[PDB]
Amino acid sequence: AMGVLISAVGDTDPFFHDGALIHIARKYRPEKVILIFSEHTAKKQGNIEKALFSIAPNYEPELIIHPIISDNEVHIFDVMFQRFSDILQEYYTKEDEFILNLSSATPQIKSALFVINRLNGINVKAVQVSSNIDELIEVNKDNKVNFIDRTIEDNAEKFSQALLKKTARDFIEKFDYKAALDILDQLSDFPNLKSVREEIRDVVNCLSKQDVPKGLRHKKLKEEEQKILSAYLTIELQRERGNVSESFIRIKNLTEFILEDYIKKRYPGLISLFDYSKLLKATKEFKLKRTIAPIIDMNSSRNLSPLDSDAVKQLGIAMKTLKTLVREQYHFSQSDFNFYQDLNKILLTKLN
Amino acid sequence: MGVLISAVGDTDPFRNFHDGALIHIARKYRPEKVILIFSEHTAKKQGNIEKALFSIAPNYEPELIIHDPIISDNEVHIFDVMFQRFSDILQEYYTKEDEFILNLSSATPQIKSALFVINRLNNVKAVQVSSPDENIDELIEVNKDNKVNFIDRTIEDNFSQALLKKTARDFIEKFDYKAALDILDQLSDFPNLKSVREEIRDVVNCLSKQDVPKGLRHLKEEEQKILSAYLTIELQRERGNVSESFIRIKNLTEFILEDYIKKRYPGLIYLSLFDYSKLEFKLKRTIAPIIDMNSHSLSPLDSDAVKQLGIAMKTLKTLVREQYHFSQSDFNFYQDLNKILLTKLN
């Protein structure tokens, strides 16, 4: 990797103490002295060099002269950004660092450098500087090894990630872990990366597989619990999203899973929903038939290739009878019915 | 409402022959809310700026907002300081309903920079006006651009939205309509925007309730369905919802194997797939894999089952095309819609 200072050369460069460029270049000690001079920054072409080189021998750089800058369009706003946005675009800096040495030059440039660096969503440093050719280049106030380095970098989020974060966040809170996941995998290194990713990752993987997610692998009463929880929220979570045709499947599963669970106990089996429906009466069932009814009104009603509109309610009304249904047959908890709410709350706040 | 948050700089109106940034910019884009945050120096020309503004032309005098806090002359040349000072100013009136211009010309250059910084970083726009006390009427009357016909050198340049766009692209390119939708939903107005959304929405809506997308509605009535369901199943596999495939495939075969014996011999004898498997010695060798997926209890799918979710897809795929001639002109619908969509977004 090498360091390229994609920095211009205004009135300040190169000159008791040196100029932002001199300092900028001198302090960061790079391997690419990118210089995009302008109409006035012609003159300084001559000495600017003599400065950069003559600072210290046996420390030789790349001094690449930039399309001269536009003696008129060097105080033009959007132009400044357009030129520079290109200038940055030129040397993409795949595996090197850009020294956006935007401390010196014409206002527009300075502003523009910043907006570039600050915008520029990747590893590229934006920088500032706080305030006889060979003659001056001898008595330079920072012409030694151990000098007061006034160079101080920006150290921002890049703001690229900002949108990324926000935009990925809104999905996690939107209940869309798949969305969130992808968002996140784009996101460049960040502490709470692992915890966001790893978390999202475990949630993702688990859901698809049809296992308990190995996060909500809580101390439940065997598979029947974990799975019974895992499903119970697979449908809930699901219903949260969109898949209003997922419900039917999930429910009709559980509607059975538990249906067979209770039947397995009361009147030990001793052998569809109509198998439930019939079994309900004769086999120590009465109150369960009321419960299991609407549940079994949806599954039969659901059944062509059309989709009713009262079903959009029947789904809802199905859920309460499926939530309520499970609470009875198994005594879970609202503390353990927040699995993902927690996940989201730990998650969201881990994002922040 | 169009409300420009303009600085109150020294070269205000009375800035030579032509009109002066503030008043200049203001006229050009005729705003309804002439937002002005005036600092210590510019505090003098507080009244004048009112005269010129209003005296620019009648039947177009907006309610101007004198900035709530006086600007301090310690933040004149103030670099980042003004950036903050700006940062808050913008935040004060988010007015996502309305739109804003950040007058490039304003006053101290730092405040300028900030005004830019504010605008670049992130609904409201801004453009400066390229170059050429107590005058009052003297200034206004003999104004060099003080007449309806004037040269509009106030020309502004034209990021986050772009980034969001691409962000939302990939989702469409991943075949995630909900995603794409979302990132669109928030997105602002654009030329393709309507269509990119409109279709997206119709496809989500179309996929939502058991019906067939507007586009996909081009075959007979049912054939639309028999097929318009399939691509459902195909879209499924795309985004790893393996769980959905089984019941789609299942519903698929039988919706067809039945709608195939409807005419090839009405028969009576829910009609389970086990029933169809009995009722065509040749057919009963092609729909074997679909009957292989017949045989869970809250349990998961072993590594192998994900294969079955595939051989069956080849079972149902070839099953679709065989019994109904459709052609790869159909089962590219979404392959195209991607390309239409993506082309569109461009």
Residue numbers in the entry:
A (entry chain A): 0 to 14, 17 to 67, 69 to 133, 149 to 288, 301 to 332, 338 to 386
B (entry chain B): 1 to 122, 125 to 134, 147 to 172, 176 to 235, 238 to 288, 299 to 308, 314 to 329, 336 to 386
Q: What did the paper state?
A:
Csm6 ribonucleases bind cOA using a CARF (CRISPR-associated Rossmann Fold) domain, resulting in activation of a fused HEPN (Higher Eukaryotes and Prokaryotes Nucleotide binding) ribonuclease domain. Here we characterised the cyclic hexa-adenylate (cA6) activated Csm6’ ribonuclease from the industrially important bacterium Streptococcus thermophilus.
Aside from a couple of disordered regions, the peptide backbone of apo StCsm6’ could be built with confidence, but far fewer side chains were modelled due to the low resolution of the data. The structure revealed that apo StCsm6’, like in the complex with cA6, is a symmetrical dimer in an ‘X’ arrangement. The monomeric form of the individual CARF, 6H and HEPN domains of StCsm6’ are very similar in the apo structure and in complex with cA6, with RMSD values of 1.4 Å or lower over the entirety of each domain. The only difference to note is that one of the loops in the CARF domain (residues 133–149), which encloses the active site in the complex with cA6, could not be modelled in the apo structure, presumably due to conformational flexibility in this region which may not be stabilized until cA6 is bound. Unfortunately, a number of the active site residues could not be modelled in the apo StCsm6’ structure; this could reflect the flexibility in this region prior to cA6 binding which forms the functional active site, but also could be a consequence of the lower resolution data. One caveat is that the EiCsm6 structure may have been influenced by the presence of a non-hydrolysable cA6 mimic bound to the CARF domains.
